[PDB]
Design an enzyme around this catalytic site. Structure first.
Site: not given
Lengths: 216, 213, 216
Positions: A137-138
């Site tokens: 994820a980010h």
């Protein structure tokens, strides 16, 4: 003999990786593909020849490329050095249904299996393996020779150092921009582990919540 | 009239399976589909007639096919013998986004819901149900009437015997070629279980690590 | 001019949501999009302007629409109330690979990330957020301002009331048509929790099996 492609590792994930490579290069004929495996040398597997590394390198071909299906990160790094001595190309492999969003930088030798996802603003090193359903994820930073088993869940603001292994179904709590959650060099997150805080280098953590495992 | 398709089970997964079967057979008109349910018989569900089994068997149609959307393994086997008595076809159902790689052998009556994955060199028996996000990895052998709840994770070199049930989000450690990890006949792997060793027949395991319940 | 789209939240899931909303409305040029974030007002992010709310609202543009990337549901509700005052339109955003089956009813402002799945006969309220790999199965009722973290698994016959947060990798056991499993208003299901029974409003649970952790 214009190009030969090798999947290094006949046992294990090799049989999963071969069809993904076939799909990456749909205009190459089946005879341009082989498994490389010193040990299963001489045999055939799913219709493909299994070659020793020497027989592979010795084949007449203008260009050779290899994807290393071997999960063990130390062995992966060793095979990579070998391939580079012989000037063999590192193949990047992904799946048709893989999702990659914005600003994702990925080093060479990546291998992304079906149902994988990388979201936005992510730096991944060399020879990263992400098995089925795993994701990053980010704002994550992933080092070299990292391995995600199936369903490994790496949430936002996590830094994973070289040679780490994130096990099947494991989940890692997100960090923050100021305080990333760190998975230390060579650390092993065991299957089903629920990681709620940074993991020190070289340990194995297991359980929910994840705790350091006493191994002897 | 040329073909009628039945979805056995109107409660539960039946409502999920119908749209899958509709997409699997796009050129069939709505009127060629029905739920089969003794109980909800006579009623209507998401626009489809719900018929008793007898009513279904009695409809005038050259050919008849059924997918059994019932998770309970024992009921499933019962309904199968019923269908075979009446020469009804077993329908195989996959999702558009299902992924299957090399050398996967699958027996009749399989049901693979969205986001399912079967990798390479796999043998699966009859009436296998894999719910959403479940997967089977390399070199596994799966018997008959096996059921994967959503998110069940079957890794490599695992042998899962007849009637086993793998619960939601459960995860099974890989075996090796010399020593497969074995899930015994009728074993139940409870939801969220983390299975690190073989599970004896007829036993339930739960927890992380999984332990006999 | 004509239409501008704001993504409310530069941090957290903002950088994930921006490319999703770009794909949702592919004919709009990049210049028509901005991140909305008071804190980061005046900066740029992934090549996009980051605007304060006031500056966004002040833009010359017949129509303004926003997707709120912010997972924090308490903040999300206040932001909606703010947006209604200025008559800003709420966007629904899905991902290309999102699956939705039969009879799924969804309130405005939904956000469905990659690899999400909604099955059949489901009622979902307003401003629902489903992050990657999360799903809602048959016969569920889901209230307003509910947030599913990545990998959250909501099985059949579950009622999740307003403002509940389902943590990353959590699994919730199915209820029955007679006895739905209930996640209470504002409850927090912790990452990795295996929920085997109803959770009281306003408490947090964690573990396998899930147990009440914070109840005061």
């Amino acid at each position: 003999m214009t190009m030969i492609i090798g999947v290094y590792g006949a046992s294990g994930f090799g049989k999963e990786v071969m069809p993904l490579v076939r799909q990456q290069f749909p205009t190459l004929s089946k005879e341009q593909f082989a498994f490389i495996d010193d040990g299963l040398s001489g045999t055939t597997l799913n219709g493909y020849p299994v070659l020793s590394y020497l027989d592979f390198i010795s084949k007449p071909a203008d260009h050779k490329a290899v994807t290393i299906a071997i999960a063990n990160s130390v062995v992966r790094e060793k095979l990579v050095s070998l391939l580079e001595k012989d000037g063999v190309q590192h193949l990047a492999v992904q799946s048709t249904n893989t999702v990659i969003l914005d600003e994702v930088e990925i080093g060479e030798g990546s291998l992304l299996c079906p149902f994988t996802c990388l979201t936005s603003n992510i730096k991944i090193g060399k020879f990263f393996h992400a098995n089925i359903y795993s994701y990053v994820a980010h704002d994550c930073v992933i080092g070299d020779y990292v391995t995600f088993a199936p369903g490994a869940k790496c949430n936002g603001n996590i830094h994973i150092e070289d040679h780490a292994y994130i096990g099947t179904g494991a989940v890692i709590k997100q960090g923050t921009p100021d305080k990333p959650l760190i998975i230390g060099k060579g650390a092993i997150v065991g299957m089903g582990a629920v990681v709620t805080k940074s993991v020190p280098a070289g340990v194995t953590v297991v359980g929910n919540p994840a705790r350091i495992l006493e191994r002897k």
